[PDB]
């Protein structure tokens, strides 16, 4: 089997992407944030504290003839951005782009943090990291991909995120029309539960490539590109007037600037992030100070190849017995 679904930016900045997901019988379609950095499929629901729901579409398990309460199971998650959610668990039928899993754990939120409430466009998350990170207790549950894997034509999924445009998540096949050149595959460590890999270096604009190992995670659920402070300083030094602002929370730059590209290495291959991908617009409405899309990972504890990086590539998440990651230009 295979599946193919379009993923759509939630706003004009590509702050996140939403993908429609069918849950239950009859189907209830919710728009979920596919997150290769976590491993829980959780949804706003009829059980979510009413004051914490503000415009989201909810899953109502009592209206699904295939929903079953997973007795005694609870979940609770905290994300890198400080947001969080928790609740109980159902199993139900879940379909993505024509690919159906029966008995998928659907984690129903009883509580969500303010950042989730305040984002009306995201109805929940669909985790695509390794199932070892799943938070369901006392019996850990499998991700949608893990459950689908054996049925797929090939045990892979691909992320093809657009810049200011829709893109695609495919399951079970590689669309050879969706990228240019070849896909370069690179080793993955699953030791921390992430799609963790080592970039071979970087360049800023038309500058020379610096060969240096950068361990980090391919994370579709993180907006920006978080890299070591040395790398990030080298990038912003090429933008007149750019500075790190403690009050704003990172590098900002004059909105009048033209940003240089940023290149990262994948083995001997190179992925080029155009300068415009690195512009996240005014820090507040009407400001001429703009927020940068490349930020320091210092104090995160891990480098993160988030959407800024991934949307410059066609990315293969290869879930073979020994997982690997593939990157192509597009």
PDB file of C-alpha atoms in Angstrom:
ATOM      1  CA  UNK A   1       0.000   0.000   0.000  1.00  0.00           C
ATOM      2  CA  UNK A   2       0.858   3.677  -0.244  1.00  0.00           C
ATOM      3  CA  UNK A   3      -0.534   7.033   0.834  1.00  0.00           C
ATOM      4  CA  UNK A   4      -0.089  10.590  -0.426  1.00  0.00           C
ATOM      5  CA  UNK A   5      -1.366  13.744   1.273  1.00  0.00           C
ATOM      6  CA  UNK A   6      -0.879  17.425   0.661  1.00  0.00           C
ATOM      7  CA  UNK A   7       0.598  19.480   3.485  1.00  0.00           C
ATOM      8  CA  UNK A   8      -0.219  23.198   3.687  1.00  0.00           C
ATOM      9  CA  UNK A   9       1.466  26.087   5.532  1.00  0.00           C
ATOM     10  CA  UNK A  10      -0.678  27.439   8.385  1.00  0.00           C
ATOM     11  CA  UNK A  11       0.249  31.048   7.677  1.00  0.00           C
ATOM     12  CA  UNK A  12       2.235  33.335   5.373  1.00  0.00           C
ATOM     13  CA  UNK A  13       5.512  32.588   7.199  1.00  0.00           C
ATOM     14  CA  UNK A  14       5.375  28.771   6.964  1.00  0.00           C
ATOM     15  CA  UNK A  15       5.324  28.633  10.780  1.00  0.00           C
ATOM     16  CA  UNK A  16       4.055  25.050  10.553  1.00  0.00           C
ATOM     17  CA  UNK A  17       2.321  22.748   8.081  1.00  0.00           C
ATOM     18  CA  UNK A  18      -1.005  20.938   8.417  1.00  0.00           C
ATOM     19  CA  UNK A  19      -2.056  17.722   6.721  1.00  0.00           C
ATOM     20  CA  UNK A  20      -5.617  16.362   6.714  1.00  0.00           C
ATOM     21  CA  UNK A  21      -6.090  13.070   8.584  1.00  0.00           C
ATOM     22  CA  UNK A  22      -9.218  10.924   8.666  1.00  0.00           C
ATOM     23  CA  UNK A  23     -10.025   9.478  12.105  1.00  0.00           C
ATOM     24  CA  UNK A  24     -12.858   7.128  12.967  1.00  0.00           C
ATOM     25  CA  UNK A  25     -16.002   5.826  11.317  1.00  0.00           C
ATOM     26  CA  UNK A  26     -17.581   7.775   9.733  1.00  0.00           C
ATOM     27  CA  UNK A  27     -14.397   9.746   9.120  1.00  0.00           C
ATOM     28  CA  UNK A  28     -13.684  12.854  11.187  1.00  0.00           C
ATOM     29  CA  UNK A  29     -11.087  14.916   9.314  1.00  0.00           C
ATOM     30  CA  UNK A  30      -8.631  16.837  11.477  1.00  0.00           C
ATOM     31  CA  UNK A  31      -5.690  18.917  10.277  1.00  0.00           C
ATOM     32  CA  UNK A  32      -2.592  17.614  12.049  1.00  0.00           C
ATOM     33  CA  UNK A  33       0.991  18.830  12.330  1.00  0.00           C
ATOM     34  CA  UNK A  34       3.166  15.955  11.092  1.00  0.00           C
ATOM     35  CA  UNK A  35       6.162  15.963  13.439  1.00  0.00           C
ATOM     36  CA  UNK A  36       9.244  13.853  12.759  1.00  0.00           C
ATOM     37  CA  UNK A  37      10.584  15.030  16.133  1.00  0.00           C
ATOM     38  CA  UNK A  38       7.941  13.330  18.310  1.00  0.00           C
ATOM     39  CA  UNK A  39       6.005  10.087  18.460  1.00  0.00           C
ATOM     40  CA  UNK A  40       2.482  10.772  19.724  1.00  0.00           C
ATOM     41  CA  UNK A  41      -0.633  11.163  17.586  1.00  0.00           C
ATOM     42  CA  UNK A  42      -2.792  13.467  19.715  1.00  0.00           C
ATOM     43  CA  UNK A  43      -5.890  15.474  18.945  1.00  0.00           C
ATOM     44  CA  UNK A  44      -8.160  18.165  20.234  1.00  0.00           C
ATOM     45  CA  UNK A  45     -11.288  16.332  21.264  1.00  0.00           C
ATOM     46  CA  UNK A  46     -14.699  16.392  22.892  1.00  0.00           C
ATOM     47  CA  UNK A  47     -12.759  15.713  26.119  1.00  0.00           C
ATOM     48  CA  UNK A  48     -10.565  18.827  25.872  1.00  0.00           C
ATOM     49  CA  UNK A  49     -11.230  21.403  28.595  1.00  0.00           C
ATOM     50  CA  UNK A  50     -13.702  23.759  26.918  1.00  0.00           C
ATOM     51  CA  UNK A  51     -11.830  26.970  27.747  1.00  0.00           C
ATOM     52  CA  UNK A  52      -8.746  25.538  26.017  1.00  0.00           C
ATOM     53  CA  UNK A  53     -10.493  25.017  22.670  1.00  0.00           C
ATOM     54  CA  UNK A  54     -10.592  28.074  20.390  1.00  0.00           C
ATOM     55  CA  UNK A  55     -11.538  27.245  16.799  1.00  0.00           C
ATOM     56  CA  UNK A  56      -9.922  23.827  16.409  1.00  0.00           C
ATOM     57  CA  UNK A  57     -11.752  20.888  14.928  1.00  0.00           C
ATOM     58  CA  UNK A  58     -12.283  18.192  17.558  1.00  0.00           C
ATOM     59  CA  UNK A  59     -12.346  14.406  17.488  1.00  0.00           C
ATOM     60  CA  UNK A  60     -15.448  13.009  19.199  1.00  0.00           C
ATOM     61  CA  UNK A  61     -14.792   9.325  19.900  1.00  0.00           C
ATOM     62  CA  UNK A  62     -18.392   8.658  20.960  1.00  0.00           C
ATOM     63  CA  UNK A  63     -19.429   9.380  17.347  1.00  0.00           C
ATOM     64  CA  UNK A  64     -16.969   6.839  15.918  1.00  0.00           C
ATOM     65  CA  UNK A  65     -18.241   3.276  15.695  1.00  0.00           C
ATOM     66  CA  UNK A  66     -14.665   1.985  15.521  1.00  0.00           C
ATOM     67  CA  UNK A  67     -13.311   3.923  18.538  1.00  0.00           C
ATOM     68  CA  UNK A  68     -12.385   1.936  21.637  1.00  0.00           C
ATOM     69  CA  UNK A  69     -11.107   3.367  24.906  1.00  0.00           C
ATOM     70  CA  UNK A  70      -7.650   1.992  25.637  1.00  0.00           C
ATOM     71  CA  UNK A  71      -8.361   1.142  29.232  1.00  0.00           C
ATOM     72  CA  UNK A  72      -6.130   2.776  31.813  1.00  0.00           C
ATOM     73  CA  UNK A  73      -3.911   4.495  29.247  1.00  0.00           C
ATOM     74  CA  UNK A  74      -2.838   8.104  29.668  1.00  0.00           C
ATOM     75  CA  UNK A  75      -0.347  10.375  27.930  1.00  0.00           C
ATOM     76  CA  UNK A  76       1.489  13.600  28.670  1.00  0.00           C
ATOM     77  CA  UNK A  77       4.015  15.380  26.495  1.00  0.00           C
ATOM     78  CA  UNK A  78       6.179  18.465  26.663  1.00  0.00           C
ATOM     79  CA  UNK A  79       7.763  19.920  23.544  1.00  0.00           C
ATOM     80  CA  UNK A  80      11.030  21.779  23.001  1.00  0.00           C
ATOM     81  CA  UNK A  81       9.193  25.091  22.684  1.00  0.00           C
ATOM     82  CA  UNK A  82       7.711  24.711  26.168  1.00  0.00           C
ATOM     83  CA  UNK A  83       4.241  23.708  24.985  1.00  0.00           C
ATOM     84  CA  UNK A  84       2.468  20.617  26.338  1.00  0.00           C
ATOM     85  CA  UNK A  85      -0.677  18.494  26.313  1.00  0.00           C
ATOM     86  CA  UNK A  86      -2.093  15.403  28.044  1.00  0.00           C
ATOM     87  CA  UNK A  87      -5.104  13.107  28.204  1.00  0.00           C
ATOM     88  CA  UNK A  88      -6.388   9.584  27.628  1.00  0.00           C
ATOM     89  CA  UNK A  89      -6.250   7.198  24.689  1.00  0.00           C
ATOM     90  CA  UNK A  90      -8.516   5.523  22.166  1.00  0.00           C
ATOM     91  CA  UNK A  91      -7.726   3.130  19.374  1.00  0.00           C
ATOM     92  CA  UNK A  92      -9.433   3.903  16.071  1.00  0.00           C
ATOM     93  CA  UNK A  93      -9.023   3.769  12.307  1.00  0.00           C
ATOM     94  CA  UNK A  94      -6.713   6.456  10.948  1.00  0.00           C
ATOM     95  CA  UNK A  95      -6.139   7.227   7.271  1.00  0.00           C
ATOM     96  CA  UNK A  96      -3.620   9.560   5.653  1.00  0.00           C
ATOM     97  CA  UNK A  97      -3.830  10.230   1.940  1.00  0.00           C
ATOM     98  CA  UNK A  98      -5.522   6.902   1.260  1.00  0.00           C
ATOM     99  CA  UNK A  99      -3.328   4.788   3.574  1.00  0.00           C
ATOM    100  CA  UNK A 100      -5.329   3.223   6.410  1.00  0.00           C
ATOM    101  CA  UNK A 101      -4.192   1.888   9.789  1.00  0.00           C
ATOM    102  CA  UNK A 102      -6.679   0.102  12.012  1.00  0.00           C
ATOM    103  CA  UNK A 103      -6.179   0.122  15.767  1.00  0.00           C
ATOM    104  CA  UNK A 104      -4.046   3.270  15.792  1.00  0.00           C
ATOM    105  CA  UNK A 105      -3.577   4.890  19.197  1.00  0.00           C
ATOM    106  CA  UNK A 106      -5.339   8.263  19.044  1.00  0.00           C
ATOM    107  CA  UNK A 107      -4.402  10.297  22.084  1.00  0.00           C
ATOM    108  CA  UNK A 108      -7.320  12.482  23.124  1.00  0.00           C
ATOM    109  CA  UNK A 109      -6.366  15.728  24.849  1.00  0.00           C
ATOM    110  CA  UNK A 110      -7.994  16.620  28.128  1.00  0.00           C
ATOM    111  CA  UNK A 111      -5.595  19.554  28.563  1.00  0.00           C
ATOM    112  CA  UNK A 112      -3.479  21.588  26.156  1.00  0.00           C
ATOM    113  CA  UNK A 113      -1.144  24.524  26.822  1.00  0.00           C
ATOM    114  CA  UNK A 114      -1.921  28.058  25.750  1.00  0.00           C
ATOM    115  CA  UNK A 115       0.165  27.973  22.570  1.00  0.00           C
ATOM    116  CA  UNK A 116      -1.997  25.146  21.230  1.00  0.00           C
ATOM    117  CA  UNK A 117      -5.254  26.864  22.207  1.00  0.00           C
ATOM    118  CA  UNK A 118      -4.081  30.055  20.549  1.00  0.00           C
ATOM    119  CA  UNK A 119      -3.377  28.330  17.237  1.00  0.00           C
ATOM    120  CA  UNK A 120      -6.763  27.644  15.692  1.00  0.00           C
ATOM    121  CA  UNK A 121      -5.249  26.004  12.586  1.00  0.00           C
ATOM    122  CA  UNK A 122      -3.651  22.954  14.264  1.00  0.00           C
ATOM    123  CA  UNK A 123      -6.026  20.243  15.479  1.00  0.00           C
ATOM    124  CA  UNK A 124      -3.263  18.035  16.910  1.00  0.00           C
ATOM    125  CA  UNK A 125       0.046  16.366  16.079  1.00  0.00           C
ATOM    126  CA  UNK A 126       0.965  13.186  14.224  1.00  0.00           C
ATOM    127  CA  UNK A 127       4.352  11.990  15.435  1.00  0.00           C
ATOM    128  CA  UNK A 128       6.773  10.392  13.003  1.00  0.00           C
ATOM    129  CA  UNK A 129       9.880   9.927  15.169  1.00  0.00           C
ATOM    130  CA  UNK A 130      10.649   6.492  16.622  1.00  0.00           C
ATOM    131  CA  UNK A 131       8.030   4.783  18.781  1.00  0.00           C
ATOM    132  CA  UNK A 132      10.476   4.597  21.693  1.00  0.00           C
ATOM    133  CA  UNK A 133       9.548   8.264  22.366  1.00  0.00           C
ATOM    134  CA  UNK A 134       5.799   7.628  22.581  1.00  0.00           C
ATOM    135  CA  UNK A 135       4.487   8.862  25.936  1.00  0.00           C
ATOM    136  CA  UNK A 136       1.500   6.555  26.454  1.00  0.00           C
ATOM    137  CA  UNK A 137       1.537   4.867  29.863  1.00  0.00           C
ATOM    138  CA  UNK A 138       1.542   2.142  31.065  1.00  0.00           C
ATOM    139  CA  UNK A 139       1.743   0.547  27.603  1.00  0.00           C
ATOM    140  CA  UNK A 140       3.720   2.531  25.041  1.00  0.00           C
ATOM    141  CA  UNK A 141       2.041   2.834  21.646  1.00  0.00           C
ATOM    142  CA  UNK A 142       3.299   2.786  18.058  1.00  0.00           C
ATOM    143  CA  UNK A 143       3.348   5.672  15.608  1.00  0.00           C
ATOM    144  CA  UNK A 144       1.169   5.713  12.508  1.00  0.00           C
ATOM    145  CA  UNK A 145       4.254   4.965  10.376  1.00  0.00           C
ATOM    146  CA  UNK A 146       5.355   2.091  12.605  1.00  0.00           C
ATOM    147  CA  UNK A 147       1.864   0.556  12.375  1.00  0.00           C
ATOM    148  CA  UNK A 148       1.685   1.020   8.581  1.00  0.00           C
ATOM    149  CA  UNK A 149       5.242  -0.030   7.792  1.00  0.00           C
ATOM    150  CA  UNK A 150       4.794  -3.728   7.109  1.00  0.00           C
ATOM    151  CA  UNK A 151       1.914  -3.028   4.697  1.00  0.00           C
ATOM    152  CA  UNK A 152       3.745  -0.343   2.731  1.00  0.00           C
ATOM    153  CA  UNK A 153       5.247  -1.096  -0.685  1.00  0.00           C
ATOM    154  CA  UNK A 154       8.571   0.176   0.762  1.00  0.00           C
ATOM    155  CA  UNK A 155       9.128   1.028   4.465  1.00  0.00           C
ATOM    156  CA  UNK A 156       9.616   4.746   3.894  1.00  0.00           C
ATOM    157  CA  UNK A 157       7.903   8.088   4.041  1.00  0.00           C
ATOM    158  CA  UNK A 158       8.952  11.331   2.373  1.00  0.00           C
ATOM    159  CA  UNK A 159       8.599  15.003   3.287  1.00  0.00           C
ATOM    160  CA  UNK A 160       8.402  17.559   0.477  1.00  0.00           C
ATOM    161  CA  UNK A 161       7.591  20.821   2.220  1.00  0.00           C
ATOM    162  CA  UNK A 162       6.904  23.936   0.170  1.00  0.00           C
ATOM    163  CA  UNK A 163       8.209  27.458   0.569  1.00  0.00           C
ATOM    164  CA  UNK A 164       5.138  29.661   0.937  1.00  0.00           C
ATOM    165  CA  UNK A 165       3.245  26.881  -0.878  1.00  0.00           C
ATOM    166  CA  UNK A 166       1.734  23.441  -0.288  1.00  0.00           C
ATOM    167  CA  UNK A 167       3.837  20.304  -0.405  1.00  0.00           C
ATOM    168  CA  UNK A 168       3.443  16.568   0.069  1.00  0.00           C
ATOM    169  CA  UNK A 169       3.896  13.711   2.526  1.00  0.00           C
ATOM    170  CA  UNK A 170       4.108  10.317   0.816  1.00  0.00           C
ATOM    171  CA  UNK A 171       4.063   6.927   2.526  1.00  0.00           C
ATOM    172  CA  UNK A 172       5.424   3.743   0.990  1.00  0.00           C
ATOM    173  CA  UNK A 173       7.041   5.088  -2.200  1.00  0.00           C
ATOM    174  CA  UNK A 174       9.544   7.566  -3.534  1.00  0.00           C
ATOM    175  CA  UNK A 175       8.145   9.928  -6.189  1.00  0.00           C
ATOM    176  CA  UNK A 176      11.043  10.161  -8.615  1.00  0.00           C
ATOM    177  CA  UNK A 177       9.443  13.172 -10.317  1.00  0.00           C
ATOM    178  CA  UNK A 178       9.538  15.241  -7.110  1.00  0.00           C
ATOM    179  CA  UNK A 179      13.268  16.007  -6.982  1.00  0.00           C
ATOM    180  CA  UNK A 180      16.217  16.837  -9.207  1.00  0.00           C
ATOM    181  CA  UNK A 181      19.470  14.914  -9.416  1.00  0.00           C
ATOM    182  CA  UNK A 182      20.010  12.031  -7.015  1.00  0.00           C
ATOM    183  CA  UNK A 183      19.038  11.306  -3.435  1.00  0.00           C
ATOM    184  CA  UNK A 184      22.038  11.158  -1.098  1.00  0.00           C
ATOM    185  CA  UNK A 185      21.514   8.824   1.826  1.00  0.00           C
ATOM    186  CA  UNK A 186      23.193   9.282   5.173  1.00  0.00           C
ATOM    187  CA  UNK A 187      23.386   7.304   8.422  1.00  0.00           C
ATOM    188  CA  UNK A 188      20.857   7.694  11.242  1.00  0.00           C
ATOM    189  CA  UNK A 189      21.242   7.135  14.971  1.00  0.00           C
ATOM    190  CA  UNK A 190      18.004   6.157  16.704  1.00  0.00           C
ATOM    191  CA  UNK A 191      19.635   6.265  20.150  1.00  0.00           C
ATOM    192  CA  UNK A 192      17.651   9.348  21.239  1.00  0.00           C
ATOM    193  CA  UNK A 193      14.505   8.312  19.351  1.00  0.00           C
ATOM    194  CA  UNK A 194      14.979  10.924  16.626  1.00  0.00           C
ATOM    195  CA  UNK A 195      15.933  10.933  12.949  1.00  0.00           C
ATOM    196  CA  UNK A 196      19.422  11.978  14.033  1.00  0.00           C
ATOM    197  CA  UNK A 197      22.176  12.362  11.446  1.00  0.00           C
ATOM    198  CA  UNK A 198      25.463  14.190  10.835  1.00  0.00           C
ATOM    199  CA  UNK A 199      25.753  16.957   8.281  1.00  0.00           C
ATOM    200  CA  UNK A 200      29.172  17.279   6.661  1.00  0.00           C
ATOM    201  CA  UNK A 201      29.364  21.083   6.873  1.00  0.00           C
ATOM    202  CA  UNK A 202      28.068  24.385   5.615  1.00  0.00           C
ATOM    203  CA  UNK A 203      28.577  27.459   3.497  1.00  0.00           C
ATOM    204  CA  UNK A 204      27.212  31.000   3.776  1.00  0.00           C
ATOM    205  CA  UNK A 205      26.116  32.602   0.517  1.00  0.00           C
ATOM    206  CA  UNK A 206      28.754  32.179  -2.177  1.00  0.00           C
ATOM    207  CA  UNK A 207      31.418  31.525   0.452  1.00  0.00           C
ATOM    208  CA  UNK A 208      33.663  28.500   0.696  1.00  0.00           C
ATOM    209  CA  UNK A 209      32.288  25.288   2.159  1.00  0.00           C
ATOM    210  CA  UNK A 210      33.440  24.514   5.707  1.00  0.00           C
ATOM    211  CA  UNK A 211      33.846  20.781   6.296  1.00  0.00           C
ATOM    212  CA  UNK A 212      32.727  20.056   9.838  1.00  0.00           C
ATOM    213  CA  UNK A 213      30.471  17.433  11.400  1.00  0.00           C
ATOM    214  CA  UNK A 214      27.142  18.775  12.668  1.00  0.00           C
ATOM    215  CA  UNK A 215      25.003  16.205  14.486  1.00  0.00           C
ATOM    216  CA  UNK A 216      21.328  17.105  14.467  1.00  0.00           C
ATOM    217  CA  UNK A 217      17.757  15.920  13.919  1.00  0.00           C
ATOM    218  CA  UNK A 218      15.474  16.121  10.883  1.00  0.00           C
ATOM    219  CA  UNK A 219      12.407  17.670  12.523  1.00  0.00           C
ATOM    220  CA  UNK A 220       9.388  18.663  10.467  1.00  0.00           C
ATOM    221  CA  UNK A 221       7.677  19.903  13.634  1.00  0.00           C
ATOM    222  CA  UNK A 222      10.241  22.647  14.314  1.00  0.00           C
ATOM    223  CA  UNK A 223       9.935  25.824  12.229  1.00  0.00           C
ATOM    224  CA  UNK A 224      13.515  27.069  12.180  1.00  0.00           C
ATOM    225  CA  UNK A 225      17.072  25.821  11.641  1.00  0.00           C
ATOM    226  CA  UNK A 226      18.966  25.604  14.966  1.00  0.00           C
ATOM    227  CA  UNK A 227      22.740  25.187  14.654  1.00  0.00           C
ATOM    228  CA  UNK A 228      25.882  25.740  16.767  1.00  0.00           C
ATOM    229  CA  UNK A 229      26.568  29.312  17.803  1.00  0.00           C
ATOM    230  CA  UNK A 230      29.766  29.452  15.718  1.00  0.00           C
ATOM    231  CA  UNK A 231      27.858  28.540  12.529  1.00  0.00           C
ATOM    232  CA  UNK A 232      24.996  30.916  13.243  1.00  0.00           C
ATOM    233  CA  UNK A 233      27.367  33.807  14.004  1.00  0.00           C
ATOM    234  CA  UNK A 234      29.174  33.197  10.701  1.00  0.00           C
ATOM    235  CA  UNK A 235      25.841  33.375   8.855  1.00  0.00           C
ATOM    236  CA  UNK A 236      24.517  36.576  10.449  1.00  0.00           C
ATOM    237  CA  UNK A 237      27.887  38.324  10.175  1.00  0.00           C
ATOM    238  CA  UNK A 238      27.114  38.484   6.422  1.00  0.00           C
ATOM    239  CA  UNK A 239      23.931  40.521   7.022  1.00  0.00           C
ATOM    240  CA  UNK A 240      24.557  44.221   7.711  1.00  0.00           C
ATOM    241  CA  UNK A 241      22.897  45.274  10.941  1.00  0.00           C
ATOM    242  CA  UNK A 242      21.995  41.761  12.102  1.00  0.00           C
ATOM    243  CA  UNK A 243      22.425  41.096  15.812  1.00  0.00           C
ATOM    244  CA  UNK A 244      21.445  38.673  18.518  1.00  0.00           C
ATOM    245  CA  UNK A 245      18.759  40.222  20.693  1.00  0.00           C
ATOM    246  CA  UNK A 246      18.290  38.757  24.159  1.00  0.00           C
ATOM    247  CA  UNK A 247      15.007  40.674  24.512  1.00  0.00           C
ATOM    248  CA  UNK A 248      13.537  39.288  21.282  1.00  0.00           C
ATOM    249  CA  UNK A 249      15.026  35.813  21.773  1.00  0.00           C
ATOM    250  CA  UNK A 250      17.458  35.411  18.902  1.00  0.00           C
ATOM    251  CA  UNK A 251      19.001  36.933  15.829  1.00  0.00           C
ATOM    252  CA  UNK A 252      17.121  39.770  14.204  1.00  0.00           C
ATOM    253  CA  UNK A 253      18.024  41.721  11.092  1.00  0.00           C
ATOM    254  CA  UNK A 254      16.898  44.850   9.260  1.00  0.00           C
ATOM    255  CA  UNK A 255      13.841  44.002   7.175  1.00  0.00           C
ATOM    256  CA  UNK A 256      15.479  45.978   4.328  1.00  0.00           C
ATOM    257  CA  UNK A 257      18.267  43.366   4.055  1.00  0.00           C
ATOM    258  CA  UNK A 258      18.791  40.865   1.280  1.00  0.00           C
ATOM    259  CA  UNK A 259      19.663  37.583   3.029  1.00  0.00           C
ATOM    260  CA  UNK A 260      22.387  35.264   1.744  1.00  0.00           C
ATOM    261  CA  UNK A 261      21.689  31.601   1.125  1.00  0.00           C
ATOM    262  CA  UNK A 262      22.833  28.886   3.511  1.00  0.00           C
ATOM    263  CA  UNK A 263      24.205  25.545   2.290  1.00  0.00           C
ATOM    264  CA  UNK A 264      24.386  22.355   4.352  1.00  0.00           C
ATOM    265  CA  UNK A 265      26.217  19.159   3.472  1.00  0.00           C
ATOM    266  CA  UNK A 266      24.758  15.683   3.166  1.00  0.00           C
ATOM    267  CA  UNK A 267      27.726  13.460   2.529  1.00  0.00           C
ATOM    268  CA  UNK A 268      29.385  14.915  -0.564  1.00  0.00           C
ATOM    269  CA  UNK A 269      26.079  16.515  -1.651  1.00  0.00           C
ATOM    270  CA  UNK A 270      24.913  20.055  -0.890  1.00  0.00           C
ATOM    271  CA  UNK A 271      21.448  21.441  -0.109  1.00  0.00           C
ATOM    272  CA  UNK A 272      21.049  25.172  -0.685  1.00  0.00           C
ATOM    273  CA  UNK A 273      18.547  27.128   1.431  1.00  0.00           C
ATOM    274  CA  UNK A 274      17.694  30.352  -0.447  1.00  0.00           C
ATOM    275  CA  UNK A 275      18.050  33.557   1.568  1.00  0.00           C
ATOM    276  CA  UNK A 276      14.324  34.281   1.418  1.00  0.00           C
ATOM    277  CA  UNK A 277      13.621  31.035   3.318  1.00  0.00           C
ATOM    278  CA  UNK A 278      15.480  32.543   6.284  1.00  0.00           C
ATOM    279  CA  UNK A 279      13.171  35.601   6.615  1.00  0.00           C
ATOM    280  CA  UNK A 280      10.493  35.242   9.313  1.00  0.00           C
ATOM    281  CA  UNK A 281       9.245  38.789   9.017  1.00  0.00           C
ATOM    282  CA  UNK A 282       8.722  41.637  11.466  1.00  0.00           C
ATOM    283  CA  UNK A 283       9.267  40.812  15.131  1.00  0.00           C
ATOM    284  CA  UNK A 284       5.961  42.586  15.841  1.00  0.00           C
ATOM    285  CA  UNK A 285       3.437  44.123  13.476  1.00  0.00           C
ATOM    286  CA  UNK A 286       4.840  47.197  11.744  1.00  0.00           C
ATOM    287  CA  UNK A 287       8.407  46.710  12.976  1.00  0.00           C
ATOM    288  CA  UNK A 288      11.359  47.101  10.620  1.00  0.00           C
ATOM    289  CA  UNK A 289      13.294  44.491  12.634  1.00  0.00           C
ATOM    290  CA  UNK A 290      12.823  41.001  11.196  1.00  0.00           C
ATOM    291  CA  UNK A 291      13.276  37.631  12.861  1.00  0.00           C
ATOM    292  CA  UNK A 292      15.907  35.261  11.510  1.00  0.00           C
ATOM    293  CA  UNK A 293      15.253  31.701  10.405  1.00  0.00           C
ATOM    294  CA  UNK A 294      18.674  30.409  11.458  1.00  0.00           C
ATOM    295  CA  UNK A 295      19.159  30.504  15.239  1.00  0.00           C
ATOM    296  CA  UNK A 296      21.582  29.148  17.812  1.00  0.00           C
ATOM    297  CA  UNK A 297      20.975  25.708  19.301  1.00  0.00           C
ATOM    298  CA  UNK A 298      23.114  26.602  22.332  1.00  0.00           C
ATOM    299  CA  UNK A 299      21.082  25.603  25.359  1.00  0.00           C
ATOM    300  CA  UNK A 300      18.663  23.463  23.329  1.00  0.00           C
ATOM    301  CA  UNK A 301      21.157  20.643  23.678  1.00  0.00           C
ATOM    302  CA  UNK A 302      20.710  19.437  20.103  1.00  0.00           C
ATOM    303  CA  UNK A 303      20.933  20.873  16.607  1.00  0.00           C
ATOM    304  CA  UNK A 304      17.637  20.885  14.724  1.00  0.00           C
ATOM    305  CA  UNK A 305      17.191  20.744  10.968  1.00  0.00           C
ATOM    306  CA  UNK A 306      13.683  22.157  11.052  1.00  0.00           C
ATOM    307  CA  UNK A 307      11.397  23.326   8.279  1.00  0.00           C
ATOM    308  CA  UNK A 308      13.750  26.104   7.085  1.00  0.00           C
ATOM    309  CA  UNK A 309      16.245  23.394   6.107  1.00  0.00           C
ATOM    310  CA  UNK A 310      13.904  20.566   5.175  1.00  0.00           C
ATOM    311  CA  UNK A 311      11.751  22.627   2.821  1.00  0.00           C
ATOM    312  CA  UNK A 312      14.833  23.205   0.625  1.00  0.00           C
ATOM    313  CA  UNK A 313      14.984  19.431  -0.004  1.00  0.00           C
ATOM    314  CA  UNK A 314      13.078  16.298  -0.859  1.00  0.00           C
ATOM    315  CA  UNK A 315      13.641  14.216   2.270  1.00  0.00           C
ATOM    316  CA  UNK A 316      13.383  10.422   2.581  1.00  0.00           C
ATOM    317  CA  UNK A 317      12.759   8.934   6.011  1.00  0.00           C
ATOM    318  CA  UNK A 318      13.860   5.350   5.392  1.00  0.00           C
ATOM    319  CA  UNK A 319      12.451   3.046   8.051  1.00  0.00           C
ATOM    320  CA  UNK A 320      14.237  -0.092   6.925  1.00  0.00           C
ATOM    321  CA  UNK A 321      15.736  -2.368   9.594  1.00  0.00           C
ATOM    322  CA  UNK A 322      18.661   0.042   9.727  1.00  0.00           C
ATOM    323  CA  UNK A 323      17.040   3.438   9.190  1.00  0.00           C
ATOM    324  CA  UNK A 324      18.663   6.103   7.020  1.00  0.00           C
ATOM    325  CA  UNK A 325      17.815   9.590   5.760  1.00  0.00           C
ATOM    326  CA  UNK A 326      17.932  10.739   2.150  1.00  0.00           C
ATOM    327  CA  UNK A 327      18.153  14.289   0.811  1.00  0.00           C
ATOM    328  CA  UNK A 328      17.746  15.560  -2.750  1.00  0.00           C
ATOM    329  CA  UNK A 329      17.573  19.036  -4.228  1.00  0.00           C
ATOM    330  CA  UNK A 330      14.278  19.925  -5.900  1.00  0.00           C
TER     331      UNK A 330
END
